[PDB]
Design a protein around this ligand. Sequence first.
Ligand SMILES: [K+]
Ligand SMILES: [K+]
Ligand SMILES: [K+]
Ligand SMILES: [K+]
Lengths: 162, 160, 162, 160, 160, 162, 160, 162
Amino acid sequence: SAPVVGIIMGSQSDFETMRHADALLTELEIPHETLIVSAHRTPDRLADYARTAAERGLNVIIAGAGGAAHLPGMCAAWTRLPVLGVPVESRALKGMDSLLSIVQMPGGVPVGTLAIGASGAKNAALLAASILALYNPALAARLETFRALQTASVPNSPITED
Amino acid sequence: SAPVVGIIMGSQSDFETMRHADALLTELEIPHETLIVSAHRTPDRLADYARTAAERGLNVIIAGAGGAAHLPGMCAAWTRLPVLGVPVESRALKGMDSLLSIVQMPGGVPVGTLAIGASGAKNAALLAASILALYNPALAARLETFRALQTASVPNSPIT
Amino acid sequence: SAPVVGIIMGSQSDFETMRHADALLTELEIPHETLIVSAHRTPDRLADYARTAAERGLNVIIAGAGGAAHLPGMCAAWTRLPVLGVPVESRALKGMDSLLSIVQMPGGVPVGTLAIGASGAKNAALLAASILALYNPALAARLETFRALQTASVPNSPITED
Amino acid sequence: SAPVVGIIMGSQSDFETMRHADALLTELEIPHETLIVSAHRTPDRLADYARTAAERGLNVIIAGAGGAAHLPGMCAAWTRLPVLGVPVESRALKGMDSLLSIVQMPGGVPVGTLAIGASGAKNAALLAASILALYNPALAARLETFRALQTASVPNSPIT
Amino acid sequence: SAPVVGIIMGSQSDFETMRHADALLTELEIPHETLIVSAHRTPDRLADYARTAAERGLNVIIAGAGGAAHLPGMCAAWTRLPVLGVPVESRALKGMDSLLSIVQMPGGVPVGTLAIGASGAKNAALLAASILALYNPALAARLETFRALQTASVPNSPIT
Amino acid sequence: SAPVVGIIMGSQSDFETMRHADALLTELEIPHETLIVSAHRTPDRLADYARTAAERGLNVIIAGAGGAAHLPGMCAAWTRLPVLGVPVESRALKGMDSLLSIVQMPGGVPVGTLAIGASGAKNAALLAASILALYNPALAARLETFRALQTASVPNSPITED
Amino acid sequence: SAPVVGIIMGSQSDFETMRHADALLTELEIPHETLIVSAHRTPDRLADYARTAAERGLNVIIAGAGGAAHLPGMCAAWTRLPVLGVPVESRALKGMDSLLSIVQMPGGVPVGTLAIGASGAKNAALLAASILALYNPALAARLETFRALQTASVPNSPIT
Amino acid sequence: SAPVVGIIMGSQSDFETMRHADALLTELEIPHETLIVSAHRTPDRLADYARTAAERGLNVIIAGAGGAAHLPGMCAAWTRLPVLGVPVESRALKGMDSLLSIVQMPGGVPVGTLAIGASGAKNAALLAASILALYNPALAARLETFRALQTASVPNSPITED
Ligand SMILES: [K+]
Ligand SMILES: [K+]
Ligand SMILES: [K+]
Ligand SMILES: [K+]
């Protein structure tokens, strides 16, 4: 089945984070593609991918990058699709550089930004699912089940151990 | 003409920022409601608003707050709708507290976070529009017009 | 005996921190309950717990959370009891996100915030004890003994070792 | 009508912030004293104030300071009473220095810390009130009225 | 008199900062062009500008932007010319977002980053001049004069 | 011989840092005492130590603390002697809390602050030595020798190894 | 009446801060010189100043600078005298850049660092005085008077 | 062949970072010298090195330092050559101190600053190469080849592994 979400990331290194987005889309049965696109090393690839995303039938782009993280923003510059950004944790600044480079977009070109790291990747997939669920009742039901199970799995008290 | 986006904000003071979201939705002719809901002062109002949002026909919630900014996250806790969060600039820490308290949601309950301040308010509206445009071709066309005009309007050189 | 302090936390993971609060209340012989309550995954549980805390005889709530840490603040929104907040250390931002999400409450709804991590948990228990000691002379004496022993246990000079 | 809360602050300049605590205690009719005590300029004054607080009948101390803000912590070192700390906004670092020097108390000597600035001053007073309300039913009722009015007073929508 | 340095900036508002680079290049009589190019609003303009820079005879690009400041980095992605980046002071975060989004380029695509604000704009021009001076002896002499006057002009003591 | 520098620290834990100050004073043959004094757990000890320091013949106090680091500042509040502060690296905030708590003293009560961690401890000893060398020619000569050897020990180029 | 403290600063603009050090030394009747020395614009002036300081009879150097603040550290590199550093508040980063570039000296070359801004300038003068007081009993007495008046002058309560 | 780039660093410790600059210049066949120069421990060496750099035929200086990182700026104060600065990652503050000490030069004396750590060192070499390539067609061709290979080496999708 044809992809409706594209997960893009700057590097193989970033996949340790972005694989969490990929897994969650698979769990919710959302067709997607998962690709490497570097804003700095493959800028013409990025332009083409973003320019053509909507005509290819994509509905949401999830983009992950670290450091001077320009991939999500430049993607948004070239597509009218919703673009969700995942800051990848960086070695020295622990993703603070990633976060600010993604979230602080000037008015006019949005990127919906999620938490630094694996939590953010998981939540980008879930936010993408929330978007798609607006027009897909089967998926809406899967997402409601996911959230109900999440709630039901929280115990009343902690386990005490050594 | 029932609302499809809800703009909610913690206080009247936040409206100096969130009015930019309200203005953009109006510009793109997206039916919406603009309300005050405080996570800390009106928590029952928040719970009811978020719980009933989907059945009332809302598709996106835009939530703005400053300081220990809990409104977007708590909204997302009660609805499966996409929730977009706008950090309002705070007096002392200039919205860094707002930003971290909104964006750093643990896995399972997302908030799509935009920039601190007026830029983020405008972008929350535009992100909401981009979501709605997936299903609404007339809106998609207006959004493409908006983006085309934004691009075309940038001057080539600065003025004295 | 019926609890007079409730220790609540967002997750089992948080208990590695919050167990220090639990231990100190036990040392000072303060009856308490220790529970998991997630602001984001069990919001209706949180509302109910906080709403009913005072009628159940609780006097102080100690709440610990990390990241976008909303549990202490939302608890305070629903109870007139004193709520003390413990920022749990987070992976990327080392509890700076936890700290700011808890301490920066707007005027009207307070959370008394303690240090990031285990120190904060211990001190939340001690601050809770200070509050209860205002009306409980036996406990006041135990707390004064605790503080006196603390002072007396500080040596005059350090040990030099390899 | 002997004081049950002590509001202390490092300097006259801090009163622009700590007056909000003073005002709230007066509003709730909580007997209190409002004083200047500097950890660095009047350390003996501080030691004596903190040492004698409990025997004078104080139940809570609210301490505000800015910069390398040591007043709350040093107060807590000398008394078993609950000490609440208000970080005063500083000129250069906007109270981030105040905040860290107050909140990061090592285990054994607590300070319950509130937000930077006027919000924190108000909340220190309200937290003091919530502590006193545990033992004082008339005050508990006034506090519940305060919170009910705060909640009810939030408008439903913003104004132009 | 074809330009050998390109000063580009994200918006008209950035010119309040980047005019200091423009002024310095004029002072040193370095032929240049001063343009607006937005990474986010005019990405195709940016790609074309950067792609063609070397063949048009540019030797250095000075790029200024604020916020999520992507203009310098994306320019460097499309050209082998040296790209110098000026973080423009932003409203909320005072250019800390600008700084990190420009300087933290991963290995393979460099941007030489200067200070936040007007100091950085001036220094980008001077760094461009120091690069051009390697090949242009008349310019090298003017640059040495500039530096000599800067050094000699510092007073020995302050004024009341 | 009677001490002319006092090295004080909040805890045994802090000695892993402050031992570097102790070692350097010993290397430069400066008599000193090395003590534990906690601002928060032994406040009366601190008051007495600082109050009496000058009459005891101390010339400089080096104080090290971490977290909400109040020891150097409260020492300075009670003595007219020069007080030098060493921020001890803290677990979560890596000494940023220590640094700001020490260096940001209001005008009127100074603390000369050195770098976070072991570098700061070493430099507090060296700054203390610089102060004492103003009136002690033998020590001035030892300090000049120390600085000359430091300079002479810097090689011209690095070693390349795996 | 030859100077025993040297106050040096990077620029005329820094004097708005460093004048507070100058004023305090005058108040305590400590002979001093107040000069501009720029690490970046007058590096040879700096090297000569620091190299000759001890033989000219200076006992303490107070050095103030902002931004990438190198003046105190480079002074300490050339003299065995105690060097005290005052971070001057910078426009964008409010002296956080000043602070880190001064305080974070690696082991072997110390700078005693004071607070950002005017507080630090005053405290650098007072720390210099406390150093000189070790050898000068008349000055020690004036310093004790200064501290006694500072302590005694703190009011007991704030004013409306 | 005579050096046209000088790589200088404050310490042997810094070479773990700066060796990446050295390697890249060697890969692009740019003659260079690699030296230790400490701003704080060998200030007269720094003055001389910077003063004489241009007359010796150097075209670019790459300077790396950590902490209170003054080496690049003081080098720039003494030479009209382009000076590129590499912030070395520091223990407590993870190079934030290094970064601000290097990049925040006042107008009049520039340092072109690169990323914290090894990325920055590599990019300082590449920026130096970009500068030299303006007047050296052989090198310009090597640099274009380097960038083309970089682009061509980016795969289209990530590898999934345990
Ligand atoms: K269970
Ligand atoms: K002992
Ligand atoms: K050697
Ligand atoms: K491949």
